Design a protein around this ligand. Structure first.
Ligand SMILES: C[C@@H]1C[C@H](C)CN(C(=O)c2cc(Br)ccc2NC(=O)CCC(=O)N2CCOCC2)C1
Length: 562
């Protein structure tokens, strides 16, 4: 058999006490009242996840697959990639990354302390000398926050990661490769090269370039678990097409054989849990690996399905295709052939794909294009999403300090949206004012990479990424207004009129502070007043070093870009 996992029966175990019910404080009810709708996943559901992820994989690889692969390799051959030094690798480690089993932590790595650096060197030397010994990994259950959807509870996802010293070695060999190769191989199809605005631009331009557009998202069931040894050796052979240092070629070969293809799973108590023969969800190449493999299989499946003039957009396991419609019947037939092809390549669907004839109704990366109007009254497309999970996570973060602040990532990514502006900005600026913590930098994630960001820099960060229009958008679409309102009903969030009222208060309190706080008041909350201020380009915006921001995806990859 080619089983994704085999298990010993040892349990997947927590590192600390786990909360599942929403923590409540004095601030909780101002945001939401239906507390029993919000939950965190815990290891107590890890057994259920183990069932879902454990299955046999069969792969039948045809001429389309090999044709597409040869093309990808030809493009990869044009990539030149560099080895990172120990220090450069060390500075990309998040301050709160999991510590080494070998008696040093993430801060020791970042400070380049001699015990960390000595060990990292010993790990590197071992990778070069040994290309066969399976590398130990830790299996953990992720604690993530959701809203119940009987339309109730998701089991915890799994995180599989090697030791801190190995992770730093992965950066040395592969950070430059994973940061640059995917855009070269996939071109405009590589989703992580785009800001939310550029993503929208790509999708709308792509949609308009078809005579009769049809689009679909493809949901692979348990994508990580569908990735086979072959898939992972095919990824490596793509990596080796690059112009690389001989030490990097050797480390990539080694990491592939010893880590990427598979390895033993160890719980937090040090017990052997079993064996993985699929994608590790917590390695540097998780995102890039998933993007390459998804694109390969999808492109091949498009050829199999004889889809006409198709354009793909791929972010890891997330896939959207836009092509030329052949009528509703023929399109449905094409999708079943596409799905059959993907299934043959070991990427069977969860939800079967369905043709869509309205761009706004296509969800990909949990997002969709929507329409609003700017200052001049012109129609503007922008990226939004269903606000349920952002608001459930916000409710959690209202009562709990967490290492990654999702509200802040969401404000950054969804700044032009009705719900991020009216609810998230209003709510969190209100708390930060009260606590006098406006100037305190908070950690957040964009495309999997960690950033340290000061909420006082939101106006200029937003201007740089979204333009000044993100502060002027009005007259959102009925479908969008209705989705937001239905979500507020579900969670028991105050209706929008209450938030407008609150934001005028938050705005005046910020203005009163003067300076950066007043800029936040001025720009972020101009929508809240009838008497509108003049929003001019912020001189600070042009000075922001926003390189590395929307270059690549690094989910699971232990990346810090501050
Ligand atoms: C009770 C709320 C319902 C929301 C849909 C809009 N709304 C807002 O406060 C609002 C919030 C943001 Br953020 C952006 C715009 C908002 N208001 C509107 O879209 C109302 C229409 C509006 O602002 N104008 C349309 C007519 O010309 C002048 C401009 C009130």
């Amino acid at each position: 058999h080619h089983m994704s996992y085999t298990w010993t029966g040892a349990l997947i175990t927590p590192c600390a006490a786990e909360e599942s019910k929403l923590p409540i404080n004095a601030l909780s009810n101002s945001l939401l009242r239906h507390h029993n709708m919000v939950y965190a996943t815990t290891s107590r559901s890890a057994g259920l996840r183990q069932k879902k992820v454990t299955f046999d994989r069969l792969q039948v690889l045809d001429d389309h697959y090999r044709d597409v692969l040869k093309e990808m390799k030809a493009k990869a051959s044009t990539v030149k990639a560099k080895l990172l030094s120990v220090e450069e690798a060390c500075k990309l480690t998040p301050p709160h990354s999991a510590k080494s089993k070998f008696g040093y932590g993430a801060k020791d790595v970042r400070n380049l302390s001699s015990k960390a650096v000595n060990h990292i060197h010993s790990v590197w030397k071992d990778l070069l000398e040994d290309t066969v010994t399976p590398i130990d990994t830790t299996i953990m259950a992720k604690n993530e926050v959701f809203c119940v959807q009987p339309e109730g509870r998701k089991p915890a996802r799994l995180i599989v990661f090697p030791d801190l010293g190995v992770r730093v070695c992965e950066k040395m060999a592969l950070y430059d490769v994973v940061s640059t190769l995917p855009q070269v191989v996939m071109g405009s199809s590589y989703g992580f090269q785009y800001s939310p605005g550029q993503r929208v631009e790509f999708l709308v331009n792509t949609w308009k370039s078809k005579k009769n557009p049809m689009g679909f998202s493809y949901d692979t069931r348990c994508f990580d678990s569908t990735v086979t040894e072959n898939d992972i050796r095919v990824e490596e052979s793509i990596y080796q097409c690059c112009d690389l240092a001989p030490e990097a070629r050797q480390a990539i070969k080694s990491l592939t054989e010893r880590l990427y293809i598979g390895g033993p799973l160890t719980n937090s108590k040090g017990q052997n849990c079993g064996y993985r023969r699929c994608r590790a969800s917590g390695v540097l190449t998780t995102s890039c690996g998933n993007t390459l493999t998804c694109y390969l299989k999808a492109s091949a499946a498009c050829r199999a399905a004889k889809l006409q003039d198709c354009t793909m957009l791929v972010n890891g396991d997330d896939l959207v295709v836009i092509c030329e419609s052949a009528g509703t019947q023929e399109d449905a037939a094409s999708l079943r052939v596409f799905t059959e092809a993907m299934t043959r390549y070991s990427a069977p669907p969860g939800d079967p794909p369905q043709p869509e004839y309205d761009l706004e109704l296509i969800t990909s990366c949990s997002s969709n294009v929507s329409v609003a109007h700017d200052a001049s009254g012109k129609r503007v497309y922008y990226l939004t999403r269903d606000p349920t999970t952002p608001l459930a996570r916000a409710a959690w973060e209202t009562a709990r300090h967490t290492p990654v602040n999702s509200w802040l990532g969401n404000i950054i990514m969804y700044a032009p949206t009705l719900w991020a502006r009216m609810i998230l900005m209003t709510h969190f600026f209100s708390i930060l004012l009260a606590q006098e913590q406006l100037e305190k930098a908070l950690d957040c994630q964009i495309y999997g990479a960690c950033y340290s960001i000061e909420p006082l820099d939101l106006p200029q960060i937003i201007e740089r990424l979204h333009g000044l229009s993100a502060f002027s958008l009005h007259s959102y679409s009925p479908g969008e207004i209705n989705r937001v309102a239905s979500c507020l009903r579900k969670l028991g969030v105050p209706p929008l009129r209450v938030w407008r009222h609150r934001a005028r208060s938050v705005r005046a309190r910020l203005l009163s502070q003067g300076g950066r706080a007043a800029t936040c008041g001025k720009y972020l909350f101009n929508w809240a007043v009838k008497t509108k201020l003049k929003l001019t380009p912020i001189p600070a915006a042009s000075r922001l070093d926003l390189s590395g921001w929307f270059v690549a995806g690094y989910s699971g990859g232990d990346i810090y870009h501050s």
